Design a binder for these strands. Structure first.
Lengths: 119, 165, 287, 138
RNA sequence: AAGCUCGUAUCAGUUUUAUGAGGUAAAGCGAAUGAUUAGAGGUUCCGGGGUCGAAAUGACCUUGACCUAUUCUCAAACUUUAAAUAUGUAAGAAGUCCUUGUUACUUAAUUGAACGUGGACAUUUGAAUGAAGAGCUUUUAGUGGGCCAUUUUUGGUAAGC
RNA sequence: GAGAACAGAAAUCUCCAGUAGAACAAAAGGGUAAAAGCCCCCUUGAUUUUGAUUUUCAGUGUGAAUACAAACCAUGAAAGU
RNA sequence: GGUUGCGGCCAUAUCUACCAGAAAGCACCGUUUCCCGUCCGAUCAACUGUAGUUAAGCUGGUAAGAGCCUGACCGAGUAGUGUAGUGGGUGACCAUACGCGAAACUCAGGUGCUGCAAUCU
């Protein structure tokens, strides 16, 4: 009925199930990378590392790393045109990804030279 | 066995005034000097009839000691109540604890001992286990030792030799 | 003696036991922590009942790691056989455990660089530094922060020669009011110490022949065995200069060897030891 | 399902391409099933459906036009691939504006067509009985 | 409308593999909450009916009053569990792999960071399918009262509302 | 479950042994347990300069809010904040 | 085997009730002269070197038992849903086509437990 900045969020910005408090001090270790692709995922414990709604679920790529807890950024883009907007999120809210085919970049290249000598 | 156990917790001494001063201002002194320790007053969280229509403040004194002044509790145990407390008769558990009523009387009055008048006739039991889970750091649940006061903490107010059994 | 039910909704950690996975860890290991980066930390000594542990660990990984060691559970062999946990073995295992004892890096960024251990040991401020690492930050543990007391003294005795822990005046053992400072006191206890003075007390007993190798005991009025067994020993990584290891021992690796029958119970304590190892246990009979 | 059709590339009423039975093919097929008609080619049906209306971005002369191949040539080779697809194969099928087949020709396909599968009609994937409803056309 | 710039670059209202995001359909109350059926068992407590009964009557007693293992049925604004549809990304590959070089950065630095040189292999051995290139710049009309259906729904007895 | 004298359903006092049912000004929802609640200790960051960001699927200024830079302080033993 | 700082999932993570515990390690425990701390109170806090204990704590085993599992089989190819019809029925609804496709219920094997660094008999 009103349009405040967390509106509708009641279940999106949800929490847990039983993991209902306190950052996994792992989810806190780990190092960014002025290039590595991050995947937003808000968590009410924090609160800059709350990503203002829309950018929920959306995966992008670290463009800033103010690594002093200040997570990175990335952007993404949105509807009509895609005008890519950038958002400075915080270290406790973002997460890695499935660029995990570089595992198959490797698999490829390597197995492919072992294919050179093989052929 | 049977390696360790039995000791006298603390002598939770408490009067329940019901005013400000110079009344509580007394139950203090009294307590204090029957005590040697000083006097932790008591709050007053909130209101109703019989006066005590005050915010959490001024209406009793807490000062309660322990240890060496052990006997200093039974220093009217036997005495005050002729070494007889809530007796008879089922499961030998006769109200693990002991009745009371307010105390005091003293602007002149004379020292004690008994006197000071009836008072907080408890500071008692509840079985056993260990020693410091009321600890700090790496805290914990006491062991699984002893009987719910009663079948234990009675047979050690039964060897201060007196009535309740 | 009560209930249970649908008590299906906890839990908490292994610091249900007591580890302060609290703002504790995640605030020493953060920041430093990012702004950079990919390394940093920063070492803490937390005392046992008998032995005084000063593990100079630093954060991260699967699980936080050990830059080196420390721990005065044997500042005895190294010259100091009675007085375990004497709040100058905080000075001791201070420098002597970690600090200078730390390390390879360590002794190396020292023993020529940094060093100044203490360049004193009299006595006052800071005692800070001016180049540079391994800049280890304190991280007590849980223990309460009582002006003057073991912990915040492993500090003041440790970095009295070495690291850049950042230890401030205020709480360092002794001295306050109303303002600083207060110079002498520390100089004293630091110099194990003021249990000499406490060794004034005349009546029944005390130690033993450790009250005969003691007694004097530096007294006199304290300057012969107290601040001497100290002074000397109380120079252990500086004077007495040794490993933090130090004599690794390794005589540990020797003492197993030693268990004394049989199996065990749980049995896996037998075999375990029995040489280093013998059967399964931590292998095929445990985690 | 529109854009599907568009990319499975068949923009005309009674028209029709050929597409390999690969799950990125299949899946698509089904997303369309409702409104198309997954036959499943025969040999002869390919021959004729080639040669007859089937050919070129413009007609037919063997190794002639059919040797912008260049993998290999022969109208009978466009077939000899297509009708046993695999190998360089179906960049071959990148070639043939496809169909412009005849409206039912002889038979119609029973009653109601524009919805179906079994249950009669059309709209579905015969086999076998995939040819005939083609057999009458080119 | 006018046109640029150059020719497989790469493009897609599309599936496919890998990886995320969802709490609505459903489902669920001998699970949270909040509703509601029904009797059971208290070796249970505060009272209205009776009893040896009758004024701190011990003791049992009949309706309520909270447990305790059960029973019955529900939820837009409740819930563990949780779909389908739709929704983010990624893809073969300018990419890895190797060598070192730059200083404001912070690490104690043979610490990394960011950038750059020299060097090996790309037409590439799951993605599929499609291209009347593709990108790009200006400009200036009309338009802003909309209406139908199928499914999904809000109000309302209903409506050609 | 313990000890009651104006208390005695309790208004309020002190002991002991377990569902987050409380508390966070104010609506509702999120969140929060060595805390984000409560008792103490010390301060005035509710600070200067900018800029960038985010919030109409957002290209419009506004309010609000996020991460930085440069200063200048607080507070802790610290890392921090 | 313990002990220190740990990661983890942090009920796929505890309860609860009994036991049992060599070796070491921690614990309990002795003690107030100092630093320091009690809304009172050396309990807590901290502060100093061995008189006495495994009794707790801890550790592990028992219940099969309360918790969540983890898997699979009926449950279930249902319930629900993507598309389709000039399908059925007054209507409500419903069936059939291809496609996705659960949850509760129960049957089982787990039990909280892996594993990091440094130590240590």
């Amino acid at each position: 009925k009103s349009h405040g900045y967390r509106s509708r969020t009641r279940y999106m910005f949800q929490r847990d199930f039983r993991k209902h408090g306190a950052v996994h001090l792992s989810t806190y270790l780990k190092v960014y990378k002025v290039g590595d692709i991050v995947d937003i995922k808000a968590n009410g414990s924090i609160q800059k590392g709350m990503p203002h709604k829309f950018y929920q679920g959306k995966t992008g790529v670290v463009y800033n790393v103010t690594k002093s807890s200040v997570g990175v950024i990335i952007n993404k883009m949105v509807g009509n045109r895609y005008l890519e907007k950038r958002l400075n999120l915080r270290v406790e809210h973002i997460k890695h990804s499935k660029c995990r085919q570089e595992f198959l970049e490797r698999v490829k290249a390597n197995a492919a030279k072992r294919a050179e000598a093989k052929a | 066995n049977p390696m360790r156990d039995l000791k006298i917790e603390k002598l939770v001494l408490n009067i329940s005034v019901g005013e400000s001063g110079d009344r509580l201002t007394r139950a203090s002194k009294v307590l204090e000097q029957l005590s040697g320790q000083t006097p932790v007053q008591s709050k007053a969280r909130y209101t109703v009839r019989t006066f005590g229509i005050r915010r959490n403040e001024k209406i009793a004194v807490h000062v309660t000691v322990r240890g060496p002044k052990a006997e200093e509790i039974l220093e009217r145990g036997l005495k005050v109540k002729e070494y007889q407390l809530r007796d008879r008769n089922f499961s030998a558990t006769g109200n693990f604890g002991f009745g009371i009523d307010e105390h005091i009387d003293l602007g002149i009055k004379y020292d004690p001992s008994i006197g000071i008048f009836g008072m907080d006739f408890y500071v008692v039991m509840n079985r056993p286990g260990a020693r410091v889970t009321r600890r700090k750091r790496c805290k914990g649940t006491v062991g699984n030792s002893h009987k719910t006061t009663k079948e234990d903490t009675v047979s050690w107010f039964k060897q201060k030799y007196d009535a309740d059994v | 003696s009560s209930a249970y039910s649908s008590r299906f909704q906890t839990p908490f950690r292994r610091r249900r036991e007591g580890k302060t996975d609290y703002y504790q860890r995640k605030r020493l290991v953060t920041q430093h922590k990012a702004k950079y980066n990919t390394p940093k930390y920063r070492l803490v000594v937390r005392f046992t009942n008998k032995d005084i542990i000063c593990q100079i660990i630093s954060s991260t990984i699967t699980g936080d790691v050990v830059l080196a060691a420390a721990y005065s559970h044997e500042l005895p062999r190294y010259g100091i056989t009675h007085g375990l946990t004497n709040w100058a073995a905080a000075y001791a295992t201070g420098l002597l455990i970690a600090r200078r004892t730390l390390q390879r890096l360590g002794l190396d960024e020292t023993y020529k660089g940094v060093e100044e251990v203490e360049g004193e040991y009299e006595l006052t401020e800071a005692v800070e530094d001016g180049p540079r690492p391994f800049k280890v930050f304190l991280d007590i543990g849980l223990q309460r922060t009582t002006t003057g007391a073991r912990v915040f003294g492993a500090l003041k005795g440790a970095s009295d020669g070495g690291l850049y822990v950042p230890h401030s005046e205020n709480r360092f053992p002794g001295w306050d009011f109303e303002t600083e400072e207060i110079d002498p006191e520390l100089l004293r206890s630091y110099i194990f110490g003021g249990h000499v003075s406490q060794y004034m007390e005349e009546l029944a007993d005390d130690d033993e022949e450790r009250f005969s190798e003691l007694f004097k005991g530096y007294l006199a009025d304290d300057i012969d065995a107290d601040s001497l067994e100290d002074i000397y020993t109380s120079a252990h990584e500086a004077i007495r200069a040794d490993p933090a290891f130090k004599p690794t021992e390794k005589k540990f690796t020797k003492e197993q060897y030693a268990a004394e029958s049989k199996k065990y119970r749980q049995t896996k304590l037998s075999k375990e030891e029995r040489a280093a190892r013998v059967a399964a246990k931590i292998a095929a009979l445990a985690g | 399902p529109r854009k599907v059709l568009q990319l499975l590339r068949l923009t005309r009423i009674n028209s029709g391409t050929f597409v390999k039975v690969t799950k990125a093919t299949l899946e698509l097929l089904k997303l369309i099933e409702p409104y198309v008609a997954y036959g499943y080619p025969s040999y002869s049906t390919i021959r004729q459906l080639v040669y007859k209306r089937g050919f070129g971005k413009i007609n037919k002369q063997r190794v002639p036009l059919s040797d912008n191949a260049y993998g290999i040539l022969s109208i009978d080779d466009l077939i000899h691939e297509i009708i046993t697809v695999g190998p360089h194969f179906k960049q071959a099928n990148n070639f043939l504006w496809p169909f412009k087949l005849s409206n039912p020709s002889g038979g119609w396909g029973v009653p109601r067509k524009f919805k179906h599968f079994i249950q009669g009609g059309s709209f579905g994937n015969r086999e076998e009985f995939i040819n005939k409803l083609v057999k009458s056309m080119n």
